[PDB]
Design a protein around this nucleic acid. Structure first.
Ligand code: CL
Ligand code: CL
Ligand code: K
Ligand code: MG
Ligand code: MG
Ligand code: MG
Ligand code: MG
Ligand code: MG
Ligand code: MG
Ligand code: MG
Ligand code: MG
Ligand code: MG
Ligand code: MG
Ligand code: NA
Ligand code: NA
Ligand code: NA
Ligand code: NA
Ligand code: NA
Ligand code: NA
Ligand code: NA
Ligand code: NA
Ligand code: NA
Ligand code: NA
Ligand code: NA
Ligand code: NA
Ligand code: NA
Ligand code: SR
Ligand code: SR
Ligand code: SR
Ligand code: SR
Ligand code: SR
Ligand code: SR
Ligand code: SR
Ligand code: SR
Ligand code: SR
Ligand code: SR
Lengths: 65, 56, 194, 46, 81
RNA sequence: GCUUUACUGCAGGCUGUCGCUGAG
RNA sequence: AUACAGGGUGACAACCCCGUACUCGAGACCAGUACGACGUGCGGUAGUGCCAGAGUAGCGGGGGUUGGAUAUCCCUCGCGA
RNA sequence: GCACGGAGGCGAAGAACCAUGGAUUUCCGAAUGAGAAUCUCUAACAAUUGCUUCGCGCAAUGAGGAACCCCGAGAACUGAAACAUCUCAGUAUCGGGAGGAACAGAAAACGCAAUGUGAUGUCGUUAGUAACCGCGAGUGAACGCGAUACAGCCCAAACC
């Protein structure tokens, strides 16, 4: 969603990795808030984050990093 | 001592266990052989034509 | 004129006479001390090998195999049998010893395929045969006009399916007419009565 | 007995499967866990 | 590639360990060693891990009890997630 | 299932012969 | 209507919807085949006993197998052009 | 998604869905560094082979598949109104092995004996004929012919 394939391909290798760590962290924090039974959730993102990370990982392999 | 009920109380040995290769609880942990898929006995998978009707 | 090969040939028509006799008497002493399957650099009966397809080239291998002499090594019936199916001593197997030899050789060299084989004598308790095997994966062979045919997929494990010369003879496929009613095109298709 | 790590993972799974069919599935399908097991009445594998 | 830290294990018992012993509890990958749990934690929240105790749970996961140095305050670390 | 000088066979043992097997 | 096969749709539907006839497109198999082309070179006369696959052909002892009977195929022991 | 909920989200930056191609693809598993009931211990084609730069450097094998196919091992109940040869049957079942099909196959053939046919499967027929057989019960072809499809070649040696 918020993150599109073009944007990803437009990132330098270093940017994708920095973007990767960033996404992984939001996810981890979502899973933390979920572990605490936290309700200020937005279930749609926890799902988007995973796809985003899969996209960046797919793009990284494609471009050769 | 009767061969029936009184003798069943002595059964607390573990023999057949979940098999690493096929998943069936048929891996004899003392023989280290699966009575279902043959693991531990043969590289090929345990099979027999008598497991079905002859013309089928 | 006569080829040098014909002399090897003529010598082997009577392995019990002349120099050959002495060679065998000497050789077998060593063979008896060797294993079941010994790879050898050169054929003992060159004329025969070349005649059967052998070539001094990469991917061509020769191995001598020995097998115990005699009839079947069968275990007597442990369950009920009518007199007819109680025999044990005079029962012989349906595969000749040369075929058993070709199979053992091929087992030893899983990647090679049996091309042909021939006899190199025997003593009172065993028989020896040399087997020509070919490497279907070696380019020297994949490029040979005379041997590349053996590289085809349907030639894999040919010895185990009776496709050898010894295999075909033993299956009663020599004759093209009378007597081959139950052998051709296969023993199995004819109900196994050949 | 003494359970290995793998045995333990398997026992854990069996424990998890041994749960109720969520109520919302009831509504969604407008109307039963056939694999419900009891530690006493039943016998697991291995 | 599997990550070490899965998520914080938050329960009454976990909170006590956090308020009374400066310990944090995590659900972690069961292939992770005590050392790998120590590093991962120091690198995720920038703290000094003093000790790590582990347990393979009946939930199929591995639980880690991480005690931070007196320099760090668990209550506060956990409070930012 | 069991027995035996029931019928018929089969292992096994003994024995001769041929091959292994040569020189005087 | 070159479409009256079949199904769906709140009841018996060619004409309400999917389809169906007609026409058209793509993939797979036929097949790396057929055809075509490159190269190679078929064949005939006379002379020459130069070459042409051995435990083989064949025989005997013992077995199995076969419709194979004297006249099947095979194994085994021995002999052997 | 099945799946007719709640909440939330994605889609005109053309999502869903479909086709083709690609990415990712934990552990055990032929399972191959060693071991192990799917885990563990300290760089690995384990094992058997071929080639070999003689170094696992380059390669092969292993296991699966509904049956079909090829090569081996091979019963008994049953029939004969008993039963031993015979039958059931080269069946059931077992060992090994290949393919998309296998196997066979260009005559030391046939022998409607001929001034004739012309690789091989297979189908129809020849025929329950010839042949076998306590000549009992039973077992049982082939050549040929009509079809299907057609296709013929390569070595060893001589001489170099
Ligand atoms: Cl082979
Ligand atoms: Cl004719
Ligand atoms: K019988
Ligand atoms: Mg040539
Ligand atoms: Mg519970
Ligand atoms: Mg512990
Ligand atoms: Mg019989
Ligand atoms: Mg392993
Ligand atoms: Mg009877
Ligand atoms: Mg056939
Ligand atoms: Mg009678
Ligand atoms: Mg018969
Ligand atoms: Mg005939
Ligand atoms: Na082989
Ligand atoms: Na129980
Ligand atoms: Na969890
Ligand atoms: Na009885
Ligand atoms: Na026969
Ligand atoms: Na004989
Ligand atoms: Na996949
Ligand atoms: Na390999
Ligand atoms: Na090597
Ligand atoms: Na009767
Ligand atoms: Na009777
Ligand atoms: Na008879
Ligand atoms: Na005629
Ligand atoms: Sr007693
Ligand atoms: Sr009692
Ligand atoms: Sr006990
Ligand atoms: Sr074993
Ligand atoms: Sr089997
Ligand atoms: Sr193979
Ligand atoms: Sr009980
Ligand atoms: Sr629990
Ligand atoms: Sr010839
Ligand atoms: Sr023709």
């Amino acid at each position: 969603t918020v993150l599109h394939v073009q944007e990803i391909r437009d990132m330098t290798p270093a940017e994708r990795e920095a973007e990767l760590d960033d996404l992984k962290t939001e996810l981890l924090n979502a899973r933390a808030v979920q572990a605490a039974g936290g309700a200020p959730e937005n279930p749609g993102r926890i799902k988007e984050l995973r796809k985003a990370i899969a996209r960046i990982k797919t793009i990284q392999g494609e471009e050769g990093d | 001592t009767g061969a029936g009920t009184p003798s069943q109380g002595k059964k607390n040995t573990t023999t057949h266990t979940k098999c690493r290769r096929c998943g069936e609880k048929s891996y004899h942990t003392k023989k280290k052989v699966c009575s279902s898929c043959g693991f531990g006995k043969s590289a090929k998978r345990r099979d027999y034509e008598w497991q079905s009707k002859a013309g089928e | 004129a006569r080829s040098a090969y014909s002399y090897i040939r003529d010598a082997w028509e009577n392995p019990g006479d002349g120099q050959l006799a002495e060679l065998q008497w000497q050789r077998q002493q060593e063979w008896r001390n060797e294993g079941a399957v010994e790879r050898i650099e050169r054929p003992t009966r060159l004329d025969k090998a070349r005649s059967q397809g052998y070539k001094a080239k990469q991917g061509v291998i020769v191995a001598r195999v020995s097998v115990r002499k005699g009839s079947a090594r069968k275990r007597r019936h442990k369950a009920g049998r009518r007199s007819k199916r109680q025999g044990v001593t005079r029962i012989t197997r349906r595969k000749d010893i040369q075929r058993v030899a070709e199979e053992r050789a091929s087992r030893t060299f899983p990647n090679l395929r049996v091309l042909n084989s021939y006899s190199v004598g025997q003593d009172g308790r065993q028989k020896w045969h040399e087997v020509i095997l070919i490497d279907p994966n070696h380019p020297a062979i994949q490029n040979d006009d005379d041997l590349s045919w053996i590289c085809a997929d349907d030639q894999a494990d040919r010895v185990f399916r009776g496709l050898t010369g010894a295999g075909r003879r033993n299956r009663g496929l020599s004759g093209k007419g009378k007597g081959s009613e139950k052998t051709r095109p296969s023993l199995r298709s004819n109900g196994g009565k050949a | 007995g003494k359970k290995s790590k793998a045995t333990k993972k398997r026992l854990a799974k069996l424990d998890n499967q041994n749960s109720r069919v969520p109520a919302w599935v009831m509504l969604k399908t407008d109307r039963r866990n056939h694999k419900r097991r009891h530690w006493r009445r039943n016998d697991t594998d291995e | 590639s599997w990550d070490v830290i899965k998520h914080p294990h938050v329960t009454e018992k976990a909170m006590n360990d956090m308020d009374f012993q400066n310990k944090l509890q995590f659900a972690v990958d069961d292939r992770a060693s005590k050392g790998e749990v120590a590093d991962a934690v120091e690198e995720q929240y920038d703290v000094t891990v003093e000790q790590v105790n582990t347990q393979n749970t009946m939930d199929g996961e591995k639980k880690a009890v991480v005690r931070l140095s007196e320099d760090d305050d668990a209550q506060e670390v956990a409070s930012r997630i």
